[PDB]
Amino acid sequence: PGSIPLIGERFPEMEVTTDHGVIKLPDHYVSQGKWFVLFSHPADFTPVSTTEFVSFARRYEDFQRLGVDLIGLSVDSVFSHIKWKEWIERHIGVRIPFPIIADPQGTVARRLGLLHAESATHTVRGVFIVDARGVIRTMLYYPMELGRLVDEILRIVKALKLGDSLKRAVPADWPNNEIIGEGLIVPPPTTEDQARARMESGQYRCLDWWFCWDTPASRDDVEEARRYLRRAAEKPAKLLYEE
């Protein structure tokens, strides 16, 4: 039994303490016309969490390019956050450029339903994808033992942004959908007159009045989405621990 915010709702208003200072969410990013990915982890100085922060750091530029910032969250204090970041930079050679929220009393975790049955003291690995209007668009709740696949989070925001501007719905596994590949779906008619006209228009390739699509996405947009997936599928040429 847990209470989580919902897709479609504005991200709960709240002032938080990060290792970059105090900021108000989602105001802080909305004001910059930025989307933001809020993600949490159990505790500082933990292995899986470290691999995740490093993964986010390496992909940071990719997020910035999409006008998407990142912000972390754990039940630890800001001193530990900073110490942990120093450890990471010193031993892994990677600098974490984004802020981490320090939520000592679980206030934030509770408002976001990040505390599950696994642990009553530490948050699981949740992910909130909020858009430039401060509206929650997607929620993922990974557990303590499983690290996230950061490239899917990039594919999600990218797909969301494309769907938003092109006024299209996105098929499964896009841009590599088995049925229409990189095609994007035209929102289904909701009335008999609409369906009738959708077919009469014959302006799109259709499988039925309720299944039409086209290919309005830029070739660069597609290639970029494909880049995320190929990076996820590729075994790294050099492993960081080797230094």
From the CB of 37, what's the least distance to a copy of itself, in Å? 14
Phi, psi of 58, rounded to the nearest 5 degrees:
-65, -30
Cα end-to-end span (Å), the chain: 45
Residue 178 engages a copy of itself in binding (rule: CB under 8 A): yes
Pick the piece of the chain touching a copy of itself (CB under 8 A) from 28-36, 64-72, 189-197. 189-197
What one-character-per-residue DSSP string does 65-94 give?
HTTEEEEEEESS-HHHHHHHHHHHHHHH--
Binding region for ligand PER (CB under 6 A) = 42, 46-49, 169
Burial environment of residue 105 by CB neighbours within 10 A (0 to 12, 13 to 18, 19 or more): exposed
The strand pairing partners of 19, in sequence order, are: 21
- What number of chain residues touch a copy of itself (CB under 8 A)? 120
215 lies in the site for a copy of itself, by CB under 8 A = no
Please report the sign of the dihedral spanned by the C-alpha atoms of residue 82, residue 87, residue 88, residue 93: positive
Among 19, 62, 69, 221, binds a copy of itself (CB under 8 A): 19
Place of tokens 């006008």: 67
Query: Contacting a copy of itself (CB under 8 A), which of 67, 180, 204, 216?
Result: 180
Q: Which of 156, 198, 217, 224 binds a copy of itself (CB under 8 A)?
A: 156
Among the residue ranges 24-32, 65-73, 136-144, the one whose residues contact a copy of itself (CB under 8 A): 136-144
